Amino acid sequence: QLPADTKDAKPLLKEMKRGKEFHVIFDCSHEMAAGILKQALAMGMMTEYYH
């Protein structure tokens, strides 16, 4: 579950990166999905490995 306090999912994305969860399904809105993508690019989670 994405954090509820604010649209800063950096701890969640870090935990996903540590757990080697490359294939991810996002149940959000496009406004929130854009922010999640921006924060995933900041952790290099947008590469050929991740889907």
Added chain:
Amino acid sequence: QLPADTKDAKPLLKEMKRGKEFHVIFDCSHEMAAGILKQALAMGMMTEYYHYIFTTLDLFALDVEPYRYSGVNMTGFRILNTENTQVSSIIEKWSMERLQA
């Protein structure tokens, strides 16, 4: 060699990514270093797999806010003795006096 007459080195970054060249030494000015960092981030080859050594001495002037969390290891050098108090005072004085560009 980075392409001439342009700063968009997307073909070069794609060639390096396809060639699986993870450790790179960049010989360019800090402006072109920032440009190539942005191109590589847009190319998706800026992760913990990649290590970049920058031979430029202005790596401290780089804006690494989008890049710190990626897990990369950007290594470089800095001859500017910023750790000194007098050097920091001179740098701040120059920055305040500049007010230009």
